[PDB]
């Protein structure tokens, strides 16, 4: 596959995908750091809804793509997202969801033609 064919296959799939953007910050940050991440998350929500034409879901368990406020390895064991992630990793036959950090999501969206 070429990058052009890769982009078209993603776009066709994104029309049939539900995306969840989580509330939980994995670690202690300042008010300034949290505001910077939140502003980036809000821009990503708009790109997925308006440009990629995905459905925004409020339930991370009813989503194909999960956008995180950090890396999955950074979330505590007691965290609901971390528990669900661990439960999915153990089941080979389970329905697969992607867990993307907000940095990985920014790079993906830029590779789709929406540079942010």
């Amino acid at each position: 596959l070429s990058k052009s064919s890769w982009r078209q296959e993603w776009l066709a799939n994104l029309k049939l995908i539900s995306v969840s953007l989580v509330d939980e910050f994995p670690s202690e940050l300042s008010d300034s750091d949290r505001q910077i991440i939140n502003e980036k998350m809000q821009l990503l929500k708009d790109i997925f809804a308006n440009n990629l034409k995905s459905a925004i879901s409020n339930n991370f368990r009813e989503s194909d793509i999960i956008i995180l406020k950090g890396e999955i390895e950074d979330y505590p064991m007691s965290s609901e997202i971390k528990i669900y992630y661990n439960e999915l990793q153990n089941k080979p036959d389970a329905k697969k969801a992607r867990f993307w950090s907000f940095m990985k999501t920014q790079r993906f969206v830029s590779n789709m033609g929406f540079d942010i």
């Binding site: 596959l1 070429s2 990058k3 890769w6 982009r7 296959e9 993603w10 799939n13 995908i17 194909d64 793509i65 697969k96 969801a97 992607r98 993307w100 990985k104 993906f108 590779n111």
Partner: peptide
Amino acid sequence: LSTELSTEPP
């Protein structure tokens, strides 16, 4: 969603 499509381009 299927695991075959990569997040990173070819």
